[PDB]
Amino acid sequence: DVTNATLETTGKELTETYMECLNGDVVEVSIANEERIVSLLSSLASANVTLKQLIGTKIGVAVGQFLSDGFPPHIVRFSKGILDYWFRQLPEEVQKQLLAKRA
C-alpha cells in the first residue's frame, strides 16, 4: 500500500532526472543518473498503485517519460514493464497505445 506522498515525491525526482538527460534532441545518461533512474523505478516496480493514485499523482506520466528511444534499452524495457503492470486491468488495445515507445 503505497502513499500518495511517496508516489508524488518519486515522480518529481524522476522528472527532474529526465530533464537532466535531455539536451534538447540528444539523450545523455550519466552513470550516476543511470543508477538513480533504476533506483527510482525499482522503488515503484512492486508498488500496487491504484487507479485513483495513477490519475491523481501522475506517476504513470513520470515513468512514461523514459519510454523514449534516446534512453538505454534496459531502462526503456523496465519502464514499460512497470506501466504494463499498472495498466493490467485495461484492454490490450488500450495498453498497447499507452506503452508505445515514444520519441
CATH topology of domain 4-98: Transcription Elongation Factor S-II; Chain A (1.20.930)
DSSP letter at 5 equals: H
Distance of alpha carbon 54 from alpha carbon 12, whole angstroms: 14
Closest CA to 83 of 69, 71, 70, 101: 101
Residue whose entry in the numeric block shows the C-alpha cell 529526465:
18
Cα dihedral 36→12→41→64 (10° resolution)? -120
Is the sign of the CA dihedral 84, 85, 87, 93 positive or negative? Answer: positive
Burial (Cβ within 10 Å: 0-12, 13-18, ≥19) of residue 83: buried
Distance of alpha carbon 6 from alpha carbon 103, whole angstroms: 28
What is the chain's Cα-based Rg?
A: 13
Distance of alpha carbon 44 from alpha carbon 60, whole angstroms: 10
H-assigned helices in 22-91: 31-45, 51-57, 59-64, 73-86
Residue 100 belongs to what H/E stretch?
A: none
Resolution of this PDB entry, in A? 2.2
Q: What is the largest CA-CA distance in the chain?
A: 38
Contact 53, 63 (CB under 8 A): no
Report residue 27: phi and psi, to 5°.
Answer: -95, 125
- Resolved by: X-ray
